[PDB]
Short mmCIF file of all heavy atoms in Angstrom, two decimals:
data_model
loop_
_atom_site.label_atom_id
_atom_site.label_comp_id
_atom_site.label_asym_id
_atom_site.label_seq_id
_atom_site.Cartn_x
_atom_site.Cartn_y
_atom_site.Cartn_z
N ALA A 38 0.20 4.22 10.96
CA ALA A 38 -0.50 3.62 12.10
C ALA A 38 -1.69 4.52 12.46
O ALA A 38 -1.62 5.36 13.35
CB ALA A 38 0.47 3.50 13.28
N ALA A 39 -2.78 4.32 11.75
CA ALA A 39 -3.95 5.18 11.82
C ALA A 39 -4.94 4.73 12.89
O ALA A 39 -4.91 3.60 13.36
CB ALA A 39 -4.63 5.20 10.44
N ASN A 40 -5.84 5.63 13.22
CA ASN A 40 -7.06 5.30 13.95
C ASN A 40 -8.26 5.40 13.00
O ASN A 40 -8.14 5.86 11.86
CB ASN A 40 -7.21 6.13 15.22
CG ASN A 40 -7.22 7.61 14.95
OD1 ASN A 40 -7.97 8.09 14.12
ND2 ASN A 40 -6.38 8.34 15.64
N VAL A 41 -9.42 4.97 13.48
CA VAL A 41 -10.57 4.84 12.59
C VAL A 41 -11.06 6.17 12.07
O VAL A 41 -11.75 6.20 11.05
CB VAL A 41 -11.75 4.09 13.24
CG1 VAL A 41 -11.39 2.64 13.54
CG2 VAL A 41 -12.26 4.79 14.50
N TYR A 42 -10.76 7.27 12.75
CA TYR A 42 -11.18 8.60 12.35
C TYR A 42 -10.13 9.31 11.51
O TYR A 42 -10.35 10.46 11.11
CB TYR A 42 -11.52 9.43 13.59
CG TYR A 42 -12.60 8.80 14.45
CD1 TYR A 42 -12.29 8.29 15.70
CD2 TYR A 42 -13.89 8.62 14.00
CE1 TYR A 42 -13.25 7.70 16.50
CE2 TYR A 42 -14.86 8.00 14.80
CZ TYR A 42 -14.52 7.55 16.04
OH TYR A 42 -15.46 6.94 16.85
N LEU A 43 -9.01 8.68 11.24
CA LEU A 43 -7.89 9.31 10.55
C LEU A 43 -7.52 10.64 11.17
O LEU A 43 -7.21 11.61 10.48
CB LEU A 43 -8.10 9.43 9.05
CG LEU A 43 -8.35 8.13 8.29
CD1 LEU A 43 -8.60 8.44 6.83
CD2 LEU A 43 -7.19 7.17 8.41
N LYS A 44 -7.48 10.68 12.50
CA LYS A 44 -7.05 11.87 13.24
C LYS A 44 -5.60 11.65 13.65
O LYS A 44 -5.31 10.89 14.57
CB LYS A 44 -7.94 12.12 14.45
CG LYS A 44 -9.32 12.66 14.10
CD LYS A 44 -9.31 13.79 13.00
CE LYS A 44 -10.45 14.83 12.99
NZ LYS A 44 -10.02 16.04 12.16
N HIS A 45 -4.70 12.33 12.95
CA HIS A 45 -3.27 12.03 13.01
C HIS A 45 -2.58 12.91 14.06
O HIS A 45 -1.79 13.78 13.74
CB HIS A 45 -2.65 12.23 11.65
CG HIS A 45 -3.35 11.49 10.57
ND1 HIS A 45 -3.54 10.12 10.59
CD2 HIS A 45 -3.92 11.96 9.44
CE1 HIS A 45 -4.21 9.80 9.49
NE2 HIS A 45 -4.43 10.89 8.78
N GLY A 46 -2.88 12.65 15.32
CA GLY A 46 -2.44 13.53 16.39
C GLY A 46 -1.13 13.19 17.06
O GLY A 46 -0.43 14.07 17.53
N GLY A 47 -0.82 11.92 17.16
CA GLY A 47 0.32 11.49 17.94
C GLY A 47 0.92 10.23 17.37
O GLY A 47 0.42 9.64 16.41
N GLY A 48 2.01 9.81 17.98
CA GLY A 48 2.70 8.62 17.53
C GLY A 48 3.21 8.76 16.11
O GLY A 48 3.54 9.85 15.64
N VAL A 49 3.25 7.63 15.41
CA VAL A 49 3.69 7.61 14.02
C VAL A 49 2.81 8.51 13.17
O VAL A 49 3.30 9.24 12.31
CB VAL A 49 3.69 6.16 13.50
CG1 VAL A 49 3.81 6.13 11.99
CG2 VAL A 49 4.77 5.35 14.17
N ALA A 50 1.49 8.46 13.37
CA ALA A 50 0.60 9.25 12.53
C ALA A 50 0.87 10.74 12.68
O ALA A 50 0.88 11.48 11.69
CB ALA A 50 -0.85 8.94 12.88
N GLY A 51 1.06 11.20 13.91
CA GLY A 51 1.33 12.61 14.12
C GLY A 51 2.63 13.03 13.47
O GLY A 51 2.73 14.13 12.93
N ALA A 52 3.65 12.15 13.50
CA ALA A 52 4.93 12.46 12.87
C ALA A 52 4.82 12.51 11.36
O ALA A 52 5.35 13.42 10.72
CB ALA A 52 5.97 11.43 13.31
N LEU A 53 4.13 11.53 10.77
CA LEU A 53 3.96 11.53 9.33
C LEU A 53 3.16 12.75 8.89
O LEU A 53 3.51 13.42 7.93
CB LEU A 53 3.26 10.25 8.85
CG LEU A 53 4.11 8.98 8.88
CD1 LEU A 53 3.23 7.81 8.53
CD2 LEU A 53 5.28 9.01 7.93
N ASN A 54 2.08 13.06 9.60
CA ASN A 54 1.27 14.20 9.19
C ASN A 54 2.07 15.50 9.27
O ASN A 54 1.99 16.33 8.36
CB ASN A 54 0.01 14.27 10.03
CG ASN A 54 -0.82 15.48 9.68
OD1 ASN A 54 -1.19 15.66 8.52
ND2 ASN A 54 -1.07 16.32 10.64
N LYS A 55 2.83 15.69 10.34
CA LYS A 55 3.63 16.90 10.48
C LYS A 55 4.61 17.03 9.32
O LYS A 55 4.82 18.13 8.82
CB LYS A 55 4.34 16.88 11.83
CG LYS A 55 5.09 18.14 12.23
CD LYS A 55 5.61 18.04 13.69
CE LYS A 55 6.88 18.83 13.95
NZ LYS A 55 7.41 18.52 15.32
N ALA A 56 5.21 15.92 8.88
CA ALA A 56 6.16 15.96 7.79
C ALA A 56 5.51 16.37 6.47
O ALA A 56 6.20 16.90 5.60
CB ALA A 56 6.81 14.59 7.65
N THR A 57 4.21 16.18 6.32
CA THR A 57 3.47 16.63 5.14
C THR A 57 2.92 18.04 5.29
O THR A 57 2.14 18.50 4.45
CB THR A 57 2.30 15.69 4.80
OG1 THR A 57 1.20 15.87 5.70
CG2 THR A 57 2.73 14.24 4.71
N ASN A 58 3.25 18.73 6.37
CA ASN A 58 2.77 20.08 6.60
C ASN A 58 1.25 20.12 6.76
O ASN A 58 0.60 21.11 6.43
CB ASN A 58 3.24 21.04 5.50
CG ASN A 58 3.06 22.49 5.85
OD1 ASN A 58 3.10 22.89 7.01
ND2 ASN A 58 2.89 23.31 4.82
N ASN A 59 0.67 19.05 7.29
CA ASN A 59 -0.76 18.89 7.55
C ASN A 59 -1.56 18.54 6.30
O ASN A 59 -2.78 18.41 6.40
CB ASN A 59 -1.38 20.10 8.25
CG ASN A 59 -2.53 19.74 9.17
OD1 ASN A 59 -2.41 18.84 10.00
ND2 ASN A 59 -3.65 20.42 9.03
N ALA A 60 -0.92 18.34 5.15
CA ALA A 60 -1.67 17.93 3.97
C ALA A 60 -2.35 16.59 4.18
O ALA A 60 -3.46 16.35 3.69
CB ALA A 60 -0.79 17.92 2.72
#
Side-chain angles (χ1 to χ4, degrees):
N40 58 52
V41 295
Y42 303 111
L43 302 178
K44 287 316 207 163
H45 307 303
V49 167
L53 287 174
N54 177 56
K55 187 173 151 188
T57 75
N58 194 29
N59 212 50

